[PDB]
Each structure stands twice: as C-alpha cells, then as structure tokens.
Design an enzyme around this catalytic site. Structure first.
Site, short mmCIF file in Angstrom:
data_model
loop_
_atom_site.label_atom_id
_atom_site.label_comp_id
_atom_site.label_asym_id
_atom_site.label_seq_id
_atom_site.Cartn_x
_atom_site.Cartn_y
_atom_site.Cartn_z
N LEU C 25 -3.65 4.47 1.19
CA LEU C 25 -3.21 3.85 2.20
C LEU C 25 -1.89 3.85 2.43
O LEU C 25 -1.10 3.42 3.46
CB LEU C 25 -3.76 2.32 2.15
CG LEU C 25 -5.25 2.18 2.39
CD1 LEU C 25 -5.36 0.70 2.12
CD2 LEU C 25 -5.72 2.47 3.69
N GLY C 28 4.05 4.35 -2.39
CA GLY C 28 5.07 3.32 -2.82
C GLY C 28 6.10 4.01 -3.54
O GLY C 28 5.95 5.00 -3.88
N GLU C 94 -3.51 -8.23 0.84
CA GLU C 94 -4.38 -8.29 2.05
C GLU C 94 -4.31 -6.84 2.71
O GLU C 94 -3.25 -6.38 2.50
CB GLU C 94 -3.68 -9.28 2.67
CG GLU C 94 -2.23 -8.95 3.37
CD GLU C 94 -1.79 -10.15 4.35
OE1 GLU C 94 -0.46 -10.64 4.11
OE2 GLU C 94 -2.12 -10.67 5.25
N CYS C 95 -5.25 -6.68 3.51
CA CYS C 95 -5.37 -5.18 3.91
C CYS C 95 -4.56 -5.34 5.50
O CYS C 95 -4.99 -6.03 6.32
CB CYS C 95 -6.80 -4.89 4.33
SG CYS C 95 -6.82 -3.11 4.50
N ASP C 139 15.18 -2.12 0.25
CA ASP C 139 14.57 -1.02 0.83
C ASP C 139 13.66 -1.27 2.16
O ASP C 139 12.41 -1.05 2.22
CB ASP C 139 13.33 -0.45 -0.16
CG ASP C 139 12.72 0.85 -0.01
OD1 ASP C 139 13.45 1.74 0.81
OD2 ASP C 139 11.77 1.33 -0.35
#
Ligand SMILES: O=C1NCCc2[nH]c(-c3ccnc(-c4cnc5ccccc5c4)c3)cc21
Ligand SMILES: O=C1NCCc2[nH]c(-c3ccnc(-c4cnc5ccccc5c4)c3)cc21
Ligand SMILES: O=C1NCCc2[nH]c(-c3ccnc(-c4cnc5ccccc5c4)c3)cc21
Ligand SMILES: O=C1NCCc2[nH]c(-c3ccnc(-c4cnc5ccccc5c4)c3)cc21
Lengths: 285, 284, 285, 283
Positions: C25, C28, C94-95, C139
C-alpha cells in the site's frame, strides 16, 4: 571629553556610616534588599547584601557601569566587609520609595494609552543605554521597575543586575561574535508593554501548557480591553513577541518607532489596566 | 548585627610610619619577623616581610579573618610596598614579647596539671575559632605560641598563617553541606602533641621516628606520668589517633570535662618545668 | 483533566488477529506498508513493518504521541513479534484508501483557490499539533498526505514518522526555555512547497542546477497559472519559502494568516492545478 | 523460597479507574501528591505525578523495591499516560490520612520517653530495610513521615524516594560512599526533635550552617533534664559530624533503648506543648 570616576570599594565597617534596619524592601536574585539610614544625614537608602565571589563581583561591576543612566537605580557606595567570618559585598543604592510600577498604576480611579507610551519610553531608554555599552539585563520584570518617590513626577528606575551579562564599512557581525543575550530583553519589553495596555500578561496558566503557548507564540488581543488600542501598537507588540529571537526588533528600532518617539502625539484613549489590575490581586502572588 | 571592617592595604612607604630595626624576632615559614617601632608613638611592633604572590596574599587574607579572635596574634596594618624593584606585603602585628610558651614554662622552680589545662584551653579556643570560620592552621607548634608580655596575666597567642588553608536545607547531614578533606583533623594532632609535652617535658615521638609516628608507638613512662590522671591520658590517646577520622573534633575537645572545668582539675605538680631545662640540648 | 492512555505493545503473534496479504500500500522511509484484514471483523487495515532498534522505537513512540490528532494517521495497535529470528515492531494503522492528495486533485474536470485554502488549513493543523508537542515531522511531502476514503467528505491525514525528531518563570523568553535548533522551520518550508504545487500543479523548484536554485531561492509565479492567484497568497508562499530558516514564518503565524483563518472568505477563483497535474504524469515518477 | 511480583506498569488512562480531584495532599521533591478515588470501590488513594525521564524511572523503581516493607508507603499501581502530549509516570499509593508525625504529637494535652522509643524503632525499621537492600533514602524528614489513619493503632510510614539512590571484609565486597550514613544523621535529628520539640540546629542562620558543620548543639534544660544519659549518648553518636564515626543502622536497631522499647521509662516529655507553642518558626 567625558570620563566618569571608577568604583572605590569602601573597606571600613558599614555600621560606622549607616544604621541598618531589618525591614525587607525587596527580594533580589541573590540576596535581599534592606532599609538603611545614613547615621550622619538621617536620610534613607537601600542595602543589597551579596556574598563575595566572581558572580557578585560581576553584578557590582556591571551595575556600576550602568549606574550613570538616569533610568537605572543609582549606586551610592559599595562596602567590602566581614560578616560571620566571610567576605561581603554590600551595595548601597538610592531609595526608590515610590514602589513598583504596577502598584502605582493599580492606585487610581484612569490610565491612558499616552501614559503607557511614556512609561515604555523610559524603560526603553534604560535598555538602550545598557545595550549600547554591551550589557544585556536578562531580567526585566515588573518587580524590577520602581519609582523614586510617590510624587507624581518621579523617575522610573530599573534594578537588579544579578542576571546581567556582557555581550562580547566592516559589517556588525565581523566586529565581534555576540549571541541572543540582548534580544531577550526585547521580549521582556513586549511582555511589559502588553500588561501595561490591558492589565494581564499575554501568557496565562489555567499551565504546563503555558510553557508551550510561549514557545508556540499563542496569545491574543481579546476584547473588551484591546478594542480601543490602535493597530499600530498591536503591531509593535507583535514584533517584540516574535518567538524567533532574530525576527525580534532591536532596541534602536524600538526607540525610533513613532509610538515611542512621539509619546505626546499618542491618543489619550483610556485603558482598562488600572481596574483589571486590582480586580486580579489573587493570581498575582 | 556584628560586622567588622575589612582589610585596607596601605600603599605609602612603611618607613614613613615606622622605624625598622633589623633585630630578628622569629623565623616564619616564608620570611622572618623583625622588631619595629612606631615613629610617632615610640611603641614596639613586629613586622613580617612577605614577597607578593598568590601564596602571601592568602596568608594575609586568612590571618586578617582570624585576627579578631583574642588568642590569635592581632594584625595592626598591612602595607604593600616596592622592595628592590619587587612588590611586597608587609604585615605589622602586635608585639608578643612574653616569648614562646615553653620558654615561660622553662623558667620557674612548679608547674601544675591545672595550669596545663588552662593553657590547653586557650590554644583550643584559637583552633575552635579557626575551624568555625573554615580555616585549618596546619602548623600549630611550640614556636607559634607566644605570650603578649612577661606580666603573669599575659594572653597566649597563635601566630603564622603560612600553612593555613580554607577548608571548603535545615536538617541536612554535615557531609552533604560541602566536601572537606582532613585539613582540620591535622590541628587536632598538634594539639595532642603539645598537650603531651605540656604534661611531661618531652615529645611523644623521639628514620625510625618516622615509623613510630605512623604506627602510633608512644608511651606514658614513669616517673613523669605516674601522677597524671587516666582521664587525661585517655584524652591524649584520642588526639593522637593515627587514623585522622578516629580523631576527636575541636568541639568535642572544648567540651571535654578536663578542658571545660579547668578550675576543678587537680593541682598535681608535673615534671615539665625541670625536664624542659634539663634537656636544652636536643631542642635545637 | 485530560489524560489519554499510553501504548500497550501486544506480544502475541499478529497472525492470530489479522490476515496479512502482501499487497503493498506504500513504501515508507524504513519498511513497506501492507494491506491486512481483521480476522474477526473482516475490516481492512494497514501494517507497517519495522525492524526493532532505537530508530524504530522512536518512530513508534513519536507516532503514538501524535496519533491523537485528527489529521494524523491513527495507530490501532503495535505488535512486537519474531520474524525470521529477529525482533519486530509491527504497527497497525487505520486504512487510508482515499489515496494520495494529488491523486484526488488529479481526478476531476475544476479546483478552486478556496479548496486549496481548506486543504492547506488541514495540513497546517497537523503540523500545528506536532509542533505544540515538540515534534518536527521533517518529511512532509505529497506521498505522506492521504485521504481516509473516496467519499467526498473524507479527512486528509499525515503519515510516516520515520524522520520525526523531538525538538528538545512566567515573563521568561522562548530561547531561555530550552535550546532547540531549526528542526521545526523545516516543516514550514514543506508547507510552502506543497502550497505552491496546490495552486498551479508543478513544484517551485525544477530540473544539479536545481540544487543551487533551491539554496539561492530562485523561483517564480509564471503565467498563465499564477495570473489569477491573489497577491496575498503569493506573499504567504514567498514567506514560507525563505531560504534563511529563521526568516521563515512559524506554524502559529501561519494558522493565523487570514487566507488560512477564513477559508470560507477566500475567492472561488479556479486554478489550473487539476489539468496541469494529469498533463504532467511523466516527470512525476 | 520468597519471590514477590515485579512491577507491571499499567498503560490505560488513569481516569478509567480513578476519579482525580485536585486537593493537594503534599508537595513531593519532584511533583505534588493529589487525592483520588477508586471509581469502582469509592475508596481513597494518593496520586503522585511525575514526568517520565531517567530520574522518575528510578524513583518508581527504587520505591517499588522498598514497597514490601511494612513501614514504607505502599505503591498500589503505576500508570504510564500521556498528559499534554508528554509521557507520565503516575504512582497510586495507599492513603495516609493520619497526617504527619509531628502533627499527631502536637495534638494531646502527654507524650512519653517510651513512646518516642517506639516511634524511633519503627522509623529505624524502615531505614534498616532500605539499607539491607542497598538503598539510601537521603531525605528522611518530618514531612516524609505519615500515619495510615487517625486511629490510635495506626502504622507510621516513610514516603518520597525522590532522592533515594542505590549504594552500589565488607570493603572488599563493593565500593560504597557515605550515602547510607546520611540517613543515620536524619535519624538523630528526628530523635532530638521527638524528645524536646525543637531541632538541635537553630535559626533564631547563615551561622546555623556553621553550627551544623562544627557540631554545636546542646541538651538544654528544662526539656532535657529528665532525659536519661543513655539516650543523650545515642543522639550524640548519630549526630557526629564525621560520617564514618556515625553509628550504623544495625548498631542502632541493637541499642537497648530501641531493642526494648517496653523497658524504657515512662517519663513525660515537653514535646507535645513545645511543638504547638512554636507554630510560627515551623513554616
Ligand atoms: O536589585 C534588586 N532586586 C530585587 C528588587 C530590588 N529592589 C531594590 C530597591 C532598590 C531601592 N529601593 C527599593 C525600595 C525602597 N523603598 C520602597 C518602599 C516601598 C516599596 C518598595 C520599595 C523599594 C528597592 C533593589 C532590587
Ligand atoms: O608569623 C610568624 N612566623 C614565625 C614565628 C613568629 N613570631 C612572630 C612574632 C609576632 C609578634 N611578636 C613576636 C615577638 C616579639 N618580641 C619578642 C621578644 C622576645 C622573644 C620573642 C619575641 C617575639 C614574634 C610572628 C611569627
Ligand atoms: O508510514 C508510511 N510510509 C510511507 C507511505 C505510507 N502509506 C501508508 C498508508 C497507511 C494507511 N493506508 C494506506 C493506504 C490504504 N489504501 C490505499 C488505497 C489506494 C491508494 C493508497 C492507499 C494507501 C497507506 C503509511 C505509510
Ligand atoms: O512522596 C511524597 N513526598 C512528599 C510528601 C508526600 N506525601 C505523600 C502521601 C502519601 C499518601 N498519603 C498522603 C496523605 C493522605 N491523607 C492526608 C490527610 C491529611 C494530611 C496529609 C495527608 C497525606 C500523603 C507522599 C509524599
């Protein structure tokens, strides 16, 4: 050609010359201030007691240097005595019996924007002198601003050099290093100006959350107190209260600001300060 | 409210105010003591000559602080002068013409335990004051104890701060209020050595002397010590402990009944007076 | 009296509670993010996998602290498991299936100045929270700004604490209350860059001579994109993109700026962003 | 085989479990103590609030270790929460509503030498436990000694580990400085106050500081005229200025005056009255 005399430290016992009461006139950063009387002349003075060391030596040294300024408490004499078998610097200074700045404001029933301008100007003059001879005060607070007398034409004077520190075509950076010692007085001036115009500080308690509101720079000009105050002043306060030290106004730019420059051309608009100050005797302890 | 005045160093030439003879009155740890006379008053004083430096500055500074005590030689004035193109601290002090402590003892024909207790108490009082203002003397010896006059009621006074050193909320232990090493407990040893001589006429320690001191080997031999009360021997035993921390403190000493009640101590006569003159040789 | 609960790290195997797919998804700064499903509830979540060490411990610790803020991706659970005989922090969050910020903008056919103001305000709120609890994000970029759902009232949320760092009487100056370097003012630059892209569709700094245009501060507001944009906004952007970190605006000053303050009083003027963004799919890889 | 359980730090919000009032019950060395109530049980407890760091972590750690002792305030629970975006150790401890030691003495009208012996013994037991598990308290004062209830059979308990420190032939088994012997001094100061009602070291000041380092104090009449020489001697030995000359906690607990509390004369002391009669210079 202006030279002023240097400091002659008196070595004889202070009680030869003065009657020392134990009425406390104030609590300094390193030692209390007592009421004393000139034995020969009967007149009243204030005595600050410091224990001899490099720290106390610097306080006396710096204070003496600034003592020339009309808006800084004048040193009368400095004694070096033995007190319980340890050396002592005892500083005699003029008696400022007009009390603290916010005590005088607190005692009327009204205070005007023009008078706030005049007070800020004379505080400013003290800071300006100090900065010009490379000394940062580092502790400009309400308790350190006192009046010479109760008479309505008394002079406002700055006290306590316990935290004072020396600050050291050719550009100003190329003439000696110098960190943020000075810009830290400029913040104080902002905080004092804010209180002078409304009666409360810009930074509250409720309180570990006060510490963050200061670093974030969260404050306001709430109504009803500030609704009368000109945008020109708010803008000046906004600029002294910048959280970034280098964004902050310098003392020269401050003394040249039209609101300070022409104190007598400032609107006579009345402020809430006088009442807000007595009405809030509680959380001022 | 007691403040005492601080030290004003005179800068004018000393010879304006005093006539300086070159009669030596003693040898100090760092410079000799000469006899001098007040030019205006004719009265006699002692001058100690020191070469200006951090060491001499401390001697003067510390001595001035202690000068208030009645049992410490009183500083009259301090001069800062140029002597042979070098800076100088010259200390003028009161004249102690009663001579050294053991010179006075040595001149009779008898000395009693009660007098020894009175002498010890007044030495104690000097040490007590010093310690209380955080100064260790570090050189309490026979030569540093002099009498103000020859008159029989003269005061005994301690001299020479050449070795003196400074020793540094409301229920707090003494260790938590500032470090402090063994500087002080070292005076307590001197006090024990002096007390021992006072009671018998010789020192408790006689290259094998150096080891008897570190071992703590001494005795109370007869005939001198056979009259001396066990209470006193016990006090000496406790001041002469080789381990500095086992040693008694100056407050415990001034509170000891033998010192406390000088006038309730037996009048028993000691050999000190004679043993001291009878042993003029090994005292040089 | 507000306390919130602290972090309980679960030690049981994550596969007891979740079904772990290997659909990526996102990538990182230190480990990828996978799609996972709650075994009991069927509901979808995101899993970030970190290898246990002081670095990963700090990410979790700092992210948990900021997780309370509405505009920061919420941490659901943190697992500590063994994976191929090495310790592991597994973070469940959470999505955010609404996708990236600039993907949503890129999917219409128009975007207005007022919506840009509303977006900027919500990014600002996240930064404001972080700074007020003494955390710099360090960032803030397009890839770290995702929406909760595709539904048109979704919340914008900030992700990835892989670079986050901690930044450390009552009239006392902000400098005298703890040191603090330029960590924070560096988020303020990102905010400027993002704001610039939001109003025209391209970055202010373009295609080794780019590196020098950034340190020099060479950029423009070229037409036709910028010809409608009010001078007020250009001035705010100019002030976030100051090359000198201390000249840059603070987050409090930014949230108080009238363009952010009154989002709903900003002109509805249409911007080119929507089209310029899809028209430039190439040099965006 | 005696193991006791270790410390499980609770991570959930404290307000789930307790109702937190803001009535201050005491000021600690690093954070105040508030009154709180068990939401489920209605019972009263004390909460100490600390800001998480290595210092606070050690307080909790050391306190927990000593919590077993009957004469040390018992930790009920330790929470780790977020308070204004910063981490927090919150310590819940049993409620000591019997008040401070010298408040309870101050409230009669008489106190006896035997009771002072019993009080000193239970303070000693606390120190004895701490020293035996290698912890120096370093802050044994009047304010840190509280009673569990007002009931006359309440237990006296020691609080506040803000200054406590770990302390690591007996010398060859690990270094160890004067950390411990510094509690022994406090024990002497407290014993002195218990017997007469005032401290051995006065104000009226900068000259108090020197009377402590010199060891200048007395046992003045009328208060000390009944007190046995045996006790004065024990006090003299705890108040030695030289830390290594000072008695150890084992020697103290073995001293006959402490050992046989019930064979100590019932002689009445002035403490009770001198203590209320001197409410002023006790602020
Ligand atoms: O250095 C200082 N720091 C702490 C505050 C202070 N007050 C003084 C001071 C100096 C001279 N006069 C006073 C004084 C005299 N008389 C007073 C009467 C009534 C109120 C305040 C007074 C202050 C205070 C010095 C300092
Ligand atoms: O500090 C010192 N160092 C070493 C010994 C000493 N003696 C003295 C001293 C001080 C004052 N007076 C005297 C003194 C005066 N007159 C005397 C006459 C006869 C014998 C001894 C005398 C000592 C000696 C000072 C010091
Ligand atoms: O910390 C991170 N590292 C860098 C990128 C990232 N994405 C996420 C993330 C978190 C929660 N949900 C998602 C997500 C879920 N579903 C999606 C559908 C379509 C596009 C993007 C999506 C992202 C991504 C976390 C991080
Ligand atoms: O750690 C500490 N240091 C500072 C003082 C203190 N008090 C406590 C404490 C602990 C448990 N109960 C109390 C307490 C309870 N009830 C009271 C009623 C009336 C007065 C004081 C009371 C104290 C105080 C802990 C600490």
């Amino acid at each position: 050609f202006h030279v002023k005399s240097g400091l002659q430290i008196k070595k004889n016992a202070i009680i030869d010359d003065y009657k020392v009461t134990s009425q406390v006139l104030g609590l300094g950063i390193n030692g209390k201030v007592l009421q004393i009387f000139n034995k020969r002349t009967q007149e009243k003075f204030a005595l600050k007691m410091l224990q001899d060391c490099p720290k106390a030596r610097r306080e006396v040294e710096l204070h003496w240097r600034a003592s020339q300024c009309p808006h800084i408490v004048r040193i009368v004499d400095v004694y070096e005595n033995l007190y319980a078998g340890r050396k002592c610097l005892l500083i005699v200074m003029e008696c400022l019996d007009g009390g603290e700045l916010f005590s005088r404001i607190q005692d009327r029933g009204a205070f005007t924007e023009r008078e706030a301008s005049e007070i800020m100007k004379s505080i400013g003059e003290a800071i300006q002198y100090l900065h010009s001879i490379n000394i940062a005060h580092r502790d400009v607070k309400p308790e350190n601003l006192l009046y010479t007398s109760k008479r309505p034409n008394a002079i406002l004077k700055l006290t306590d050099f316990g935290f004072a520190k020396e600050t050291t075509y050719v550009a100003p950076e190329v003439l000696g290093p110098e960190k943020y010692d000075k810009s830290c007085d400029m913040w104080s001036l902002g905080v004092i100006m804010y209180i002078l115009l409304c009666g409360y500080p810009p930074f509250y308690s409720n309180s570990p959350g006060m510490k963050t509101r200061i670093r974030m720079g969260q404050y306001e000009f709430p109504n009803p107190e500030w609704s009368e105050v000109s945008e020109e002043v708010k803008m000046l306060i906004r600029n002294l209260l910048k959280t970034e030290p280098t964004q902050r106004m310098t003392i020269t730019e401050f003394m040249n600001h039209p609101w300070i420059m022409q104190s007598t051309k400032v609107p006579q608009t009345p402020l809430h300060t006088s009442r807000v100050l007595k009405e809030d005797k509680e959380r001022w302890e």
